Design a protein around this ligand. Structure first.
Ligand code: NAG
Ligand code: NAG
Ligand code: NAG
Ligand code: NAG
Ligand code: NAG
Ligand code: NAG
Ligand code: NAG
Ligand code: NAG
Ligand code: NAG
Ligand code: NAG
Ligand code: NAG
Ligand code: NAG
Ligand code: NAG
Ligand code: NAG
Ligand code: NAG
Ligand code: NAG
Lengths: 147, 98, 122, 317, 515, 164
């Protein structure tokens, strides 16, 4: 303790008195992880690999719930030109736990994925499909040359 | 006004006394917009209703600068064949200008 | 202002004790006052009285209090023991002595009676 | 100070970002209102040291003393005194700024003074103690010369001498404040120390704080929601900070005013309601008595001392 | 600019009625009931200097002010809500002459509650776990901001020792503990309300159980500490119990030095000399002092019995501190444009190469909120101590001795005092001297006899029309104009306003005692 | 949340000893010679049922000291010695002698007149920093203004004290 005081005061001499030096905090002893568990897996392969897709004019909103996600296998695989997430980091999704998930499926030209970002203005963003400025989620895009 | 005091004093039995708690303003009503007495008038009658008309090889690159061309009278005349504006609406090219 | 340029009647404002004076002294980024005080000490325990009945007339002191060390009575001031023979010029009168409480009896010397008695002796 | 109007002009988009900065400006609203209670309470503690009102008797017989200079005249609409009129002429928006008026008008301030004036003329010191007790003013100095160890023959054998000197002393008071303006600087600073903070409070809106424009309506008119939110973010920190800077300047100065006030009302106590022994506390000299007069945001005491002169040298023992 | 301002509510209290009143501030009262922000408004409209108001009616009659509106206008309840120009009490120019002194005859001895705050609760705030809360990488971004909260502790520990220094300098201004005498026969003066009583918890007094229950209101959780005060609460009474003792028993002498024996029945004789009243007024009216002193000590619990309106400053000074504590707590749930308030949601679903940018403003606005708590404490802390140094000064001149500065300890001539314990303050019992029942007499400032002036040693000359008398400046007790009570100087005619009367010489019947 | 508390060190000066004690504020001794106080858990000190006047304050009426081997001790502070004045309705005490004491009473009157240039403190000499400080407008004139007020005010204090 005396060394803590000497370090706190920036001197090698400590006078008669009471000096506050530090804080004490009981540390954790282990980790306990808890989650809801569902016997169903979320059908994400069913949407990315669907043989016929939605146009941007009539874009598909499929909904996801009551399932155990596995994004890591979807992340860790390489089939995607870009994988960007906003308000959330793409590695971290496997940690969080959500109430709903919506998969918004459609196809688009390449120079217009410059424009798909949330709050970014442009033709496709304002007339066809919009993402709010407070959007949280992930956008995936992958090039289609034989699909 | 009884429970309006309760909206910020966080209780029910408010004590006898004044409580500066609320404000007001006056809403705007008409939103008038003013400009100079327009009177500027880009000459378009000498380039559209002209008499001497040219060809494509001898196009005189004639200058229009620092006036106002009322495109609104070039809209309701409605006698055009290829009235096509590339990258700008006809509504607000009177509002944003090059 | 109140303890160098005068005497403070405010108790225990300038020094502990009854105040007399002060002296200032310079100090860096400050000042130093040296209060001089009168501090009573070395007292005794006397048996007192509030007042005296002489002939029926109650007597009270102009200043001081009536004290008794024993078989004798005195009057004296209040922050110093300096026993004085009681006289009518040390005291004053008001009313009869049936109205006072805690009173005692004693004769008051009068400084006029001896001169006058001396003349009757002549 | 309204917090919303000074931070945001009229845009609710500015008002939305303020709301998610928590309960900041309500605290600044609280403490300024806290100042607003103290300013009325300081006025309450200084002049309402009396139970009730006493107006002067109509007779002006006082053994040669004059008090017309400190008594209010009934001739004026605002029933104030001429010295007060000298004191009432030697002292000279839309952005949350709001001048709430004081609790008491200066006519009502004049009511307390005239009340304190009259009983001090007419009832000794006794009215400050209990029920009022009348006295000739010729005798009230005979109280007070006993207060500094003067036998009261000296008053009575030279009553005509004292009165004219008391009269000509008042004429100097009328002289020194109707010509010179420098001695009123103490009140003049307080309004000026108030006023400089107001002007620098408003002029901070001319500053960008690293924005593309200091005015708010331009950024709302030329950018979208996302990129202007960063620009409005820079606008809040610095406007809010200047507001907090304004509050901190107000609070510390208020404590000085709070420290000023209790010194004043004690002098209303020790030097108006009675005769203090404390030398060097109300004027220079053995203190006799005083008179209070109304003043904008302030009070002016007129102390009367006993300064001797014309000495000889004396062998003592 | 088109008009806008604050708008408030006048209420007579919640349970009293529900008739309300709305005040608009410095707006001409035309566009008022229409535009916006009206909880609807009614019928009556009245204009003042402070703006116009709705919800009352102006009354030409005036009363004592209760609720401050502005510009000399106050409001109350009648069965309804009205508004009115303030009054200032009874406007009575009382009598004046040039030959009249009003001298009181009888007198009451009242008391007055006067309470000052002496302290505040020694709050103390941890730096790091307020900002982050036992989390590593948040704390590493703290230390790159240098040494903000290092001086904030030394600010708050600096004020922590300060009220400990205040409490030390406001009570223990005697050096030693005194012991109250076991026998209780002090001239009929019943001190039973203020003495410590053994049947309570061992040191407490009878005012205290009426006082401890009267002053009430968070607790120990995240982010805060409440260190207890230095001097423990039980012995706070014990200093005051000692402070009773000598100024009950030994008198005012122990403020100077060693104590002295004196009975309390004659201590007031010195104290009656403290305002220039002779010592005969004690013993001739001792029992009359007793019941009035009993009743003043009787009423002093009774004014404080149900709910006095004079607890006030000592009740809210916990309370405005407590919300100041509490408004620090609401800032934990603030958000500042970041997408959370708890840190763990950021560490849940964000990217640690960029999540610190959301933390970056999150550190600032929480620290920005902390600076507000720094100043809000510090300004009142100086305001408490400057009040508290006055409070110990009021302990000084008014408990240890008998001061002279009028209207400094109790409205009235100061006789003595009695301090009592309190939750965070001191409660004095100022015992003043209020005279009453005046009888105005025919008076004169000087007496001429034998061409030579006469002036009393203290006091005036009154007459009931015929016979002149002598009594002192603040109490009526007529005596005979004598030789001893006056002195001589000067010729008669140099002084105006003198009346004529013979002067009795006591030496002349002494000259006539022997012939 | 599992327990925490501020930590402070009780110690005398180092020119007497290096022995110390620790105060775990607001957390008692079932979670960290031991002594339980209403301040917290106090370790390194020994309780004593005598009462010596305070030398180090702690809290809750406890004070510490370093007295004689030698150790830190804790105790409930005394308030001076228990005493009582003899009393009756017919007994008084009058001095027979006296003594002249001289008390010292020190007060501060002023402090060092410090003035700071904002532009200096923030920007070394750089024009870029100065330009970007200008665009904050006139904050830092206010700071210089306040310091100047202090500087004048400290001369006024000294003047009022000594030029009586
Ligand atoms: C279909 O996606 C799933 C996972 O979403 C993956 O197992 C499969 O290989 C994908 N199909 C192709 C052709 O890559
Ligand atoms: C331009 O100014 C003239 C000057 O009187 C006025 O008569 C005319 O109406 C103005 N033009 C317009 C469009 O207002
Ligand atoms: C051309 O002239 C006719 C009538 O002269 C008119 O109606 C028309 O608006 C004019 N158009 C242009 C472009 O000048
Ligand atoms: C004598 O005076 C001293 C003062 O300390 C005291 O001890 C003693 O009790 C006094 N006399 C009586 C009878 O108490
Ligand atoms: C003091 O009171 C007691 C009652 O016990 C009595 O005996 C004594 O004589 C009284 N003394 C005086 C001076 O009244
Ligand atoms: C006489 O009085 C004057 C006035 O101050 C003084 O200067 C002088 O020294 C005195 N005479 C003596 C002998 O002290
Ligand atoms: C309102 O309540 C307070 C305390 O709860 C009480 O003193 C007061 O008399 C009540 N008012 C009425 C009108 O009953
Ligand atoms: C409000 O307006 C009316 C007439 O428009 C005017 O008579 C009145 O004086 C105004 N109020 C004030 C406070 O000036
Ligand atoms: C009260 O004031 C009102 C408003 O000026 C006036 O009309 C009325 O005559 C006054 N007197 C009475 C008795 O109502
Ligand atoms: C003092 O008053 C209390 C009131 O309860 C009473 O019980 C007690 O007997 C009184 N004491 C004396 C000495 O009169
Ligand atoms: C003063 O005495 C006169 C004598 O007639 C009387 O009229 C007047 O009311 C008295 N004033 C008082 C008692 O205030
Ligand atoms: C005045 O007081 C004296 C005192 O005894 C009394 O003799 C006399 O009758 C009283 N009245 C008048 C009118 O003198
Ligand atoms: C008091 O005033 C009257 C007239 O008002 C006058 O005759 C008398 O001489 C005055 N007496 C004194 C003592 O001033
Ligand atoms: C203080 O320190 C030096 C070195 O330890 C020593 O010489 C001196 O005696 C010390 N003071 C005391 C009181 O021992
Ligand atoms: C800690 O909590 C209380 C608080 O003082 C204390 O009495 C107790 O000994 C400790 N806890 C337990 C479980 O003993
Ligand atoms: C401490 O007080 C306790 C009472 O429980 C006792 O055991 C012990 O002896 C006391 N200390 C001393 C020094 O007597």
């Amino acid at each position: 303790p005396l060394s803590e005081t000497k370090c706190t005061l920036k001197s090698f001499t400590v006078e008669k008195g009471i000096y506050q030096t530090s804080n004490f905090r009981v540390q954790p002893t282990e980790s306990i992880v808890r989650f809801p568990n569902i016997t169903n897996l979320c059908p994400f392969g069913e949407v990315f690999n669907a043989t016929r897709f939605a146009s941007v004019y009539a874009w598909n909103r499929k909904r996801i719930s009551n399932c155990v996600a596995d994004y890591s296998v979807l992340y860790n695989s390489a089939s995607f030109s870009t994988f960007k997430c906003y308000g959330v980091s793409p590695t971290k999704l496997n940690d969080l736990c959500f109430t709903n998930v919506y998969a918004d499926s459609f196809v688009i030209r390449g120079d217009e994925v410059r424009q798909i970002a949330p709050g970014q203005t442009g033709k496709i963003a304002d007339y066809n499909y919009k993402l709010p400025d407070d959007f949280t989620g992930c956008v995936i895009a992958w090039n289609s040359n034989n699909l | 006004p009884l429970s309006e005091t309760k909206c910020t004093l966080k209780s029910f039995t408010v004590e006898k006394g004044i409580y500066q708690t609320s404000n007001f303003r006056v809403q705007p009503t008409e939103s008038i917009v003013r400009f100079p007495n327009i009177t500027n008038l880009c000459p378009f009658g000498e380039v559209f209703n002209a008499t001497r008309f040219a060809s494509v090889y001898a196009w005189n690159r004639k200058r229009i600068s620092n006036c106002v061309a009322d495109y609104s009278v070039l809209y309701n005349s409605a006698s055009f064949s290829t009235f096509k504006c590339y990258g700008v609406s006809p509504t607000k090219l009177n509002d944003l200008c090059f | 202002s109140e303890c160098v340029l005068g005497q403070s009647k405010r108790v225990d404002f300038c020094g502990k004790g009854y105040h007399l004076m002060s002296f200032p002294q310079s100090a860096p980024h400050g000042v130093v006052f040296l209060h001089v005080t009168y501090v009573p000490a070395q007292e005794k325990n006397f048996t007192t009285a509030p007042a005296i009945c002489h002939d029926g007339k109650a007597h009270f002191p102009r200043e001081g209090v009536f004290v008794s060390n024993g078989t004798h009575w005195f009057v004296t001031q209040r922050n110093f023991y300096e026993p004085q023979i009681i006289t009518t010029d040390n005291t004053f009168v008001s009313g009869n002595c049936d109205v006072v409480i805690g009173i005692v009896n004693n004769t008051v010397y009068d400084p006029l009676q001896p001169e006058l008695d001396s003349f009757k002796e002549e | 100070v309204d917090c919303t109007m000074y931070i945001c002009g009229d845009s609710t988009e500015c008002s939305n970002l303020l709301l998610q900065y928590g309960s900041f400006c309500t605290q600044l609203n609280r403490a300024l209102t806290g100042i607003a209670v103290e300013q009325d309470k300081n006025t309450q503690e200084v002049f309402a040291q009396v139970k009730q009102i006493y107006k002067t008797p109509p007779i002006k017989d006082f053994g040669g003393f004059n008090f017309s200079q400190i008594l209010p005249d009934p001739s004026k609409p605002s029933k104030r005194s001429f010295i007060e009129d000298l004191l009432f002429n030697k002292v000279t928006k839309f952005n949350g700024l709001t001048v709430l008026p004081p609790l008491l008008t200066d006519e009502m301030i004049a009511q307390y003074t005239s009340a304190l004036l009259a009983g001090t003329i007419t009832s000794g010191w006794t009215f400050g103690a209990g029920a009022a007790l009348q006295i000739p003013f010729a005798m009230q100095m005979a109280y007070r010369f006993n207060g500094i160890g003067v036998t009261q023959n000296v008053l009575y054998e030279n009553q005509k001498l004292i009165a004219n000197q008391f009269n000509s002393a008042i004429g100097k008071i009328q002289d020194s404040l109707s010509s010179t303006a420098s001695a009123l600087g103490k009140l003049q600073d307080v309004v000026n120390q108030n006023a400089q903070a107001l002007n620098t409070l408003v002029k901070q809106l001319s500053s960008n704080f690293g924005a593309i424009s200091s005015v708010l309506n331009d950024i709302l008119s030329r950018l979208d929601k996302v990129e202007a939110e960063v620009q409005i973010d820079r606008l809040i920190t610095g406007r809010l900070q200047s507001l907090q800077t304004y509050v901190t300047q107000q609070l510390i100065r208020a404590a000085e005013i709070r420290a000023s006030a209790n010194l004043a009302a004690t002098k209303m106590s020790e030097c108006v309601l009675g005769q203090s022994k404390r030398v060097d506390f109300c004027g220079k000299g053995y203190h006799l008595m005083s008179f209070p007069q109304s003043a904008p945001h302030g009070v002016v005491f007129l102390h009367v001392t006993y300064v001797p002169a014309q000495e000889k040298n004396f062998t003592t023992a | 600019p088109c008009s806008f301002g604050g708008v408030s509510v006048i209420t007579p209290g919640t349970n009293t009625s529900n008739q309300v009143a709305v005040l608009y501030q410095d707006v001409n009262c035309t566009e008022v009931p229409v535009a916006i922000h009206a909880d609807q408004t009614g019928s009556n409209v009245f204009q003042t200097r402070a703006g116009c108001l709705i919800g009352a009616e102006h009354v030409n009659n005036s009363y004592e002010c209760d609720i401050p509106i502005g510009a000399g206008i106050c409001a109350s309840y009648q069965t309804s809500i009205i508004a009115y120009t303030m009054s200032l009490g009874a406007e009575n120019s009382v009598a004046y002459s040039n030959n009249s002194i009003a001298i009181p005859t009888n007198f009451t001895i009242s008391v007055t509650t006067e309470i000052l705050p002496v302290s505040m609760t020694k709050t103390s705030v941890d730096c790091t776990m307020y900002i982050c809360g036992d989390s590593t990488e948040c704390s590493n971004l703290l230390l790159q901001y240098g040494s903000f909260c290092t001086q904030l502790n030394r600010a708050l520990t600096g004020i922590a020792v300060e009220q400990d220094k205040n409490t030390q300098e406001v009570f223990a201004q005697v050096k030693q503990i005194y012991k109250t005498p076991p026998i209780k026969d002090f001239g009929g003066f019943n001190f039973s309300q203020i003495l410590p009583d053994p049947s309570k918890p061992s040191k407490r007094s009878f005012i205290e159980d009426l006082l401890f229950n009267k002053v009430t209101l968070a607790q120990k959780f995240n982010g805060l500490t409440v260190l207890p005060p230095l001097l423990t609460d039980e012995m706070i009474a014990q200093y005051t119990s000692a402070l009773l003792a000598g100024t009950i028993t030994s008198g005012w002498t122990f403020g100077a030095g060693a104590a002295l024996q004196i009975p309390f029945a004659m201590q007031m004789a010195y104290r009656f000399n403290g305002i220039g009243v002779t010592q005969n007024v004690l013993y001739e009216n001792q029992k009359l002092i007793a019941n009035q002193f009993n009743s003043a000590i009787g009423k002093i619990q009774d004014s404080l019995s149900s709910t006095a309106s004079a607890l006030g400053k000592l009740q809210d000074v916990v309370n405005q501190n407590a919300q100041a504590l509490n408004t620090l707590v609401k800032q934990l749930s603030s958000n500042f444009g970041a997408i959370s308030s708890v840190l763990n949601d950021i560490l849940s679903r964000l990217d640690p190469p960029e999540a610190e940018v959301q933390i970056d403003r999150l550190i600032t606005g929480r620290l920005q909120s902390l600076q507000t708590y720094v100043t809000q404490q510090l300004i009142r802390a100086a305001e408490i101590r400057a009040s508290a140094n006055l409070a110990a000064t009021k302990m000084s001149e008014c408990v240890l001795g008998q001061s002279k500065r009028v209207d400094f300890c109790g409205k009235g001539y100061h006789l003595m005092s009695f301090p009592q314990s309190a939750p965070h303050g001191v409660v004095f019992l100022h015992v003043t001297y209020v005279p009453a029942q005046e009888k105005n007499f025919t008076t004169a400032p000087a007496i001429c006899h034998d061409g030579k002036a006469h002036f009393p040693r203290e006091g005036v000359f009154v007459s009931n029309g015929t016979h002149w008398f002598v009594t002192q400046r603040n109490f009526y007790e007529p005596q005979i104009i004598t030789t001893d009570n006056t002195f001589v100087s000067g010729n008669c005619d140099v002084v105006i306003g003198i009346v004529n009367n013979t002067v009795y010489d006591p030496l002349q019947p002494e000259l006539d005692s022997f012939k | 949340p599992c327990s925490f508390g501020g930590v402070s060190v009780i110690t005398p000066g180092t020119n007497t000893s290096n022995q110390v004690a620790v105060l775990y504020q607001g957390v008692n001794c079932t979670e960290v010679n031991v002594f339980q106080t209403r301040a917290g858990c106090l370790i390194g000190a020994e309780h004593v049922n005598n009462s010596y006047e305070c030398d180090i304050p702690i809290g809750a009426g406890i004070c510490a000291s370093y007295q004689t081997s030698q150790s830190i001790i804790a105790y409930t502070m005394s308030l001076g010695a228990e005493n009582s004045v003899a009393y009756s309705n017919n007994s008084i005490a009058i001095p027979t002698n006296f003594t002249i004491s001289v008390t010292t009473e020190i007060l501060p009157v002023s402090m060092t007149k410090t003035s700071v240039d904002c532009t200096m403190y923030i920007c070394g000499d750089s024009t870029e920093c100065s330009n970007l400080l200008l665009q904050y407008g006139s904050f830092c004139t206010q700071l210089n203004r306040a310091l100047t007020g202090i500087a004048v005010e400290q001369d006024k204090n000294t003047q009022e004290v000594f030029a009586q």
